[PDB]
């Protein structure tokens, strides 16, 4: 299934991001999962205050992965209290071409 | 202590008008209603009764020495435009006028329609 994950990180813990990117991409590729795109737009200004913050660290990942690993990736995002917000969508095809960030 | 820059909150209901002047942080200085300014009953819900309440509020904040104001109007009532014009005449420079009327995006069920 072609998914598409976005997640935002607390701007203080902006240096845990390359670690987290590795930890997650590992679990995808460690169950016959591709990574058709990964981007890191970095810190940008929030359009409204999320729990008192005014900025956060954005990470896009397009993926092709088996059902259950995406469920496990969601349980991670929950309990990791550095992740302020996340969004797992489905897609029809794989997306490789670059976003406008 | 002198302030110079504050905020003018206008609560313009159908039945009354309240006008509070606050600082930058929303700490109050002095207030004036259109019910406390003589007018009673349905007299207090006129455009004129609001003008008076604005003018009476201007003179409660003489001792704080305010020059600049921002105007936070809230409601559908008659004393919307006239309250602002009154604060202009009282000598305050008006930096910014903002509507802050609450709308629920749905929310709670309102009361039944009046059969009259």
């Amino acid at each position: 299934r072609h998914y598409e994950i976005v997640f935002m990180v607390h701007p203080d813990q902006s240096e845990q991001v390359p670690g987290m990117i590795e930890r997650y991409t590992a679990a995808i590729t460690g169950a016959e999962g591709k990574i058709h795109r990964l981007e890191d737009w970095g810190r940008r200004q929030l359009a409204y205050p999320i729990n008192k913050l005014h900025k956060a660290h954005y990470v896009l990942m397009n993926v092709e992965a088996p059902q259950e690993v995406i469920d496990e990736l969601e349980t991670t995002f929950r309990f990791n209290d550095a992740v302020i917000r996340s969004m797992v969508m489905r897609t029809k095809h794989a997306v490789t071409e670059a976003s406008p960030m | 202590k002198q302030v110079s820059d504050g905020v003018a909150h206008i609560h313009a209901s159908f039945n009354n008008t309240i006008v509070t002047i606050t600082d930058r942080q929303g700490n109050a200085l002095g207030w004036a209603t259109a019910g406390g300014s003589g007018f009673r009953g349905s007299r207090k819900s006129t455009p004129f009764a609001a003008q008076v309440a604005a003018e009476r509020c201007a003179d409660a904040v003489k001792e704080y020495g305010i020059k600049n104001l921002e105007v936070m109007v809230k409601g559908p009532g008659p004393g919307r435009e006239s309250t602002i014009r009154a604060l202009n005449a009282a000598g305050f420079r008006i930096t910014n006028i903002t509507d802050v009327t609450p709308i629920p995006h749905x929310g709670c069920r309102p009361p039944k329609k009046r059969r009259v």
């Binding site: 935002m8 359009a47 976003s99 | 903002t98």
Partner: protein, 64 residues
């Protein structure tokens, strides 16, 4: 309609420049009567804006 002319297959929640042409100053979705958007694309455009608002890429209201 733009999206017919350009041959857009899906409108993106990340193309914030394009989405900003279809919200108000207050930050409400503009009707298709006004813009001239075809009805299929109005439905996509609306989904996109609501996804953008969740990720705080667009505002819900102008008075946040």
């Amino acid at each position: 309609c733009r999206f017919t002319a350009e041959g857009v297959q899906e409108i993106d929640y990340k193309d914030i420049a394009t989405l900003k042409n279809y919200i108000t100053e207050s930050g409400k979705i503009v009707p298709s009567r006004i813009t001239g958007t075809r009805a299929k694309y109005q439905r996509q455009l609306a989904r996109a804006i609501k996804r953008a608002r969740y990720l705080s890429l667009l505002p819900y209201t102008d008075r946040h």
